[PDB]
Amino acid sequence: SATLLFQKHPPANIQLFQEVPNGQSKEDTVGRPLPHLAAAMQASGEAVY
Amino acid sequence: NKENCWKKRGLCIIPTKFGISFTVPFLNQAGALIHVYTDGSVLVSHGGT
Amino acid sequence: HFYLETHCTIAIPKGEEGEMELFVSTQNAMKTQSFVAKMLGVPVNRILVR
């Protein structure tokens, strides 16, 4: 193994979290994986720092 | 580890706990200001960044 | 009226979510805010008049 050139193993990522109760309103986003509100503008270079 | 003299693996599992609050008591306060405009849109402001 | 300062508006687009901040010689910031929002087709909460 001392003679071996660095080798990338393939990535594996698993995220486990809790579903919201079955009948929770679609408009109640508490507990849901809502993206950061500004992420699309950050990705576009529109978000102003 | 038995099978490799110049590479070794290690494995370790650690817990943590972390106390939630400002340790300065008076810092633990927060304000918000909310307006509802007459089209029913809502502007929320709060002390956080 | 002959107010010595005539009508004047500066409008600043922020580039985000339709936001705009305006500096206006007006007695009526509220209708300024809502007529700007109506013309632009955005919620009133996007528009700041000072």
From Swiss-Prot, chain A:
Post-translational events: Subject to partial proteolysis; this alters the enzyme from the dehydrogenase form (D) to the oxidase form (O).
Expression by tissue:
Detected in milk (at protein level).
The record's subcellular location field reads:
Cytoplasm; Peroxisome; Secreted
What is the recorded function of this protein according to its Swiss-Prot or TrEMBL entry?
Key enzyme in purine degradation. Catalyzes the oxidation of hypoxanthine to xanthine. Catalyzes the oxidation of xanthine to uric acid. Contributes to the generation of reactive oxygen species.
So what family is this one in?
Answer: Belongs to the xanthine dehydrogenase family.
Listed under subunit, the entry gives: Homodimer. Interacts with BTN1A1.
Return the protein name: Xanthine dehydrogenase/oxidase
Origin species, per record, is Bos taurus (Bovine)
